[PDB]
RNA sequence: UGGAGAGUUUGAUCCUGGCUCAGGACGAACGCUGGCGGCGUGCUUAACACAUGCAAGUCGAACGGAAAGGCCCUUUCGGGGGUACUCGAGUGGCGAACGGGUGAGUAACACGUGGGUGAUCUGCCCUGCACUUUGGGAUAAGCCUGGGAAACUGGGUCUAAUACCGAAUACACCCUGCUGGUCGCAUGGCCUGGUAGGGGAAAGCUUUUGCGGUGUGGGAUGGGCCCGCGGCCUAUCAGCUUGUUGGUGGGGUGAUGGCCUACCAAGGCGACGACGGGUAGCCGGCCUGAGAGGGUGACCGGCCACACUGGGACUGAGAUACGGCCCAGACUCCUACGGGAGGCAGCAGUGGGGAAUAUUGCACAAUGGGCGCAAGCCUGAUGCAGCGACGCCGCGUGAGGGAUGACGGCCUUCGGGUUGUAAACCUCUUUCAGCACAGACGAAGCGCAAGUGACGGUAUGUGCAGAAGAAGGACCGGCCAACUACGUGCCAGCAGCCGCGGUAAUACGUAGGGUCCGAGCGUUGUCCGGAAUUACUGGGCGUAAAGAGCUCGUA
């Protein structure tokens, strides 16, 4: 509020808070749409879901909006959930 | 970035430093990593000490040197073993011993006599 | 600061001689004032502090200063009365007077104190000054002709020069071989008072 | 290396036992007095309220650009174009989480010490290996325009990137299935084990000592989490607990874990003091003590906590986010009443509170830090200076000679004695101050420019003149060094205790004298000692305080 470099800062976590909220909202839509395909109980559709959805999670650990270590844990979660289906 | 810095003692007027191993976010006068040597900046000769393999080994990790104590690096040869340019020579201007007490009281005694 | 009233006084009422060669004390040995003649009661603590007054007035030490040399003379591991006495014998002005080179110590105070010497080739004045072994005091050049230098460089037939000093050269050198020890210091009255006291 | 006692209960004694005193220390305050220097140190009370000025920026070698200097073309002197040397504003990166302050909260894994992590993260830095392919859509700025008092904000058009986004490759990495060997400390770990399937990136700039981007192996640094042990007072606080104790499946996290959740079981803690109440930042250390111990946490150094009060997340490698954001509240300010702004426990400073604590100073010369290839820029961090006997230390205020011992004072036995070698005088020396001249180190530094020290023309050195400009405070009945006179009279007063004042006071007041200290000397406050007076070292209980009325018996 008092120096240049705070008020810059200002904005750009605005932005920067815009683009994560975007990606953690696809993230948590892909893990519901796979989680509800599994509740369904049918396999195909929840193996390729499960595929694109390991994809965004990985995609999202690169791009840095959540911890690789994050990826990894959702990703085993999800994979072990199909399998014991 | 862990850093090769100096951290002042002495009184007000004449300062003596401490060639430390420090991380770059602590303070001037914090807690070292490793004391690897001291300068002395208000004598004649302005003495100069520093541990050549503990600076070996700080180098070889990567820590970063201050300005002054990259020139006192170089005047030591520490600095030039570590990168191998012009060989490891040492430059480094000892203070000239001062005679013994003893020798300078036979020598009055001598005059005298 | 420093004492300058008169000397006599102390002198008179420590029951000694401190100056040494003066002839008011001795016309009249008893303390000053109206009540000098009157008898006292004996007391230890008065015996041992009278003796800290001798002591601390022969050398002109101030009180602080006096107890700062006891507690670097209890600290050393000799014993603390000869170590008290040859802290006190290893002062500059001490050391010029004993070497001959002073009437009194309190001249040799003042022409400490006024630079007139030169300790191992540096100027140094300062009557508390301490005096290591092999230690070289000289006169300094421009001093060198002056009256009172004159008149103790030719009076040296006064109270002899201790072994621990030695005066060397025709400009009144003077070398010191060692701190003096117990047995040379030849001082008036007693150290084992002074350690009662400070003990207290 | 190393423990000292004295007074006071009685007509007198011994003992027990309390009280008091002699010592040391201080972030001190007050009284009287006060010359200098060196080195330190200074809101202990209101985490009370704050005027003003500074305390975090930087990069044109990421980018479009061209507001201000430079240069060059042009001119009517109004200016106009180019340049990119350079650079306001802007996009972008890194920094801003460090450094600096405070001690409110906190009796707690906060701190100290030692471990564990087969339960974990780590930007920048160092060092291996592999890469750095390909395409796209915008938008700030600019221009036009609208709203509002202001703060600020809407729309249209337009533009760039190392900004943003899609894909390929990676098979070193992540996940899953099967499978081998091996080590264990059980979950498990390791062999980058093998094998099948799926998947995960990057950015260019610059001609100059050239800087950069991505993944991955290993270092280094900085953390996180868990645990043993240790350091307050209070049962006139005996019960406490229901995500509370454990399990399973999920969720969540960098990570384990009731961290969260559904179900299930009924546990868990407590006289070895749970649960309450009070107080408190912890430590290295500091003071005291013979030591054991007691008190304490100022400076300096480490850790924690907080940033008007109370909640909350966001960005980021990292957030109690002091000089960030959102909300609520109290307070202060502006308002065209519609609405807005602020946070000194940063450095100085102001008001208030108080017995009491300082300058709205100088410099980035040195050290440390941030950005930059670099030159360089920023830095109330820091280095210095100013103020205060606040503390420690050192020095001076003169030295030698000088008498049947001058004058004056005071006492007197009227003789004389004391001030007193003191003084007067005769010489000597000038320390420190004063004046004059010269004048540093701190910089084997920084800079490819020619120079560069805030302190500071200081310290210091050499000359000049002259004893010339330089001493006070407390105390003097005993403890406890040091006594007389006059004044007063159970008054005025003194006093730490015992106790002193009743016209002849060594105890009040004042003068001579004396003693102890000395730029200080005393008083008050506080802690330790003396105190073996909480006795571990090192005490006691027949009559001095002290054996439960007596047994049985739980831990």
Sequence with gaps: ANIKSQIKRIRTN??????????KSSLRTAIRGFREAVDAGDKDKASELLHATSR??????????????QAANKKSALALALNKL | AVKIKLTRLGKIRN????????????????????????????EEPSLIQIDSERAQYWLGVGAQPTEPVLALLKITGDWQKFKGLPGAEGTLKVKEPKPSKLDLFNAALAEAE | ARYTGPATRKSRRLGVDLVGGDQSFEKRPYPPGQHGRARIKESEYRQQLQEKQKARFSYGVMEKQFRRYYEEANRQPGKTGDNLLRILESRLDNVVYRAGLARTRRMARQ??????????????????????????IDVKEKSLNT????IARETAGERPIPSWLQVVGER??????????????????????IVELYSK
């Design chain 1, 14 to 23: 605005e932005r920067r808070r815009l683009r994560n909220q975007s990606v």
């Design chain 1, 56 to 69: 965004k999670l990985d995609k999202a650990a690169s791009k840095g909006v959540i911890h690789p270590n």
């Design chain 2, 15 to 42: 300062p003596q430093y401490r060639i430390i191993v420090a991380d770059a976010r602590t303070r001037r006068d914090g807690r070292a990593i490793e004391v690897i040597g001291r300068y002395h900046p208000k």
């Design chain 3, 111 to 136: 022409l400490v104190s006024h630079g007139h010497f030169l300790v191992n080739g540096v100027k140094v004045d300062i009557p508390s000054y301490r005096v290591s072994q092999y230690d070289i």
């Design chain 3, 147 to 150: 009256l009172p230098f004159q």
């Design chain 3, 172 to 193: 009144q050198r003077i070398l010191v071989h060692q701190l003096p020890e117990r047995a040379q210091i030849d001082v008036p009255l007693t150290e084992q008072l």
